[PDB]
Amino acid sequence: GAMAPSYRVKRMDIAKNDEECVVNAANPRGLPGDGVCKAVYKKWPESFKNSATPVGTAKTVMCGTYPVIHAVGPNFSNYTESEGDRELAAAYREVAKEVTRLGVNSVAIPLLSTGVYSGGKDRLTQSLNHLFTAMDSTDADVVIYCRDKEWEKKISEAIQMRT
Numbered sequence: 001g002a003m004a005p006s007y008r009v010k011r012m013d014i015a016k017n018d019e020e021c022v023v024n025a026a027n028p029r030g031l032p033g034d035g036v037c038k039a040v041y042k043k044w045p046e047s048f049k050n051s052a053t054p055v056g057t058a059k060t061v062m063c064g065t066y067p068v069i070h071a072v073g074p075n076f077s078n079y080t081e082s083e084g085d086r087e088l089a090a091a092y093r094e095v096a097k098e099v100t101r102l103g104v105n106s107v108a109i110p111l112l113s114t115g116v117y118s119g120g121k122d123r124l125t126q127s128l129n130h131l132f133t134a135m136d137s138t139d140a141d142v143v144i145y146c147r148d149k150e151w152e153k154k155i156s157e158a159i160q161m162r163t
């Protein structure tokens, strides 16, 4: 575990992370995809061998010794708000199981279902609160990656508001 487990947020490409493992915002079919998934595919393409996994689950594939945790958030275009909310919470619980199993002291994590799986809605708070619900019982340092300047501010505020 980390001596004093923390949450941080950085606004940059998660492919450039400084953590012991990464969470991919994956699709269920293990395809290169778009956004974070495409960045992950470019950086760690070896980790897409048999990475397909259902919605609401996480599947870890090693790129060398570097773990890539493929977490499949729901596409809110396809799910009802109720069912999508349940699957989004479930994907994060599976990330927390994998982070724990791996014994890492840090993890880089994007906000699941906030980009092209958002169904055109702002899901920062929904996705971040499911992240916290799952990750709060873990002792890894968590570094959340985002690209938008206003999202960085809002994630940073949410982290600071609970310290």
Ligand SMILES: COCC(=O)Nc1ccc(O)cc1
Pocket (backbone or CB within 6 Å): 020, 021, 065, 066, 067, 101, 102, 103, 104, 105
């Ligand atoms: C069951 O754990 C498998 C594993 O490889 N874990 C791991 C631990 C630390 C690290 O920095 C990278 C990976």
Ligand SMILES: [Cl-]
Pocket (backbone or CB within 6 Å): 011, 012, 013, 016
């Ligand atoms: Cl960058």
Ligand SMILES: [Cl-]
Pocket (backbone or CB within 6 Å): 025, 112, 113, 114, 115, 116, 117, 118
């Ligand atoms: Cl997304």
Ligand SMILES: [Cl-]
Pocket (backbone or CB within 6 Å): 146, 147, 148, 151
């Ligand atoms: Cl963002």
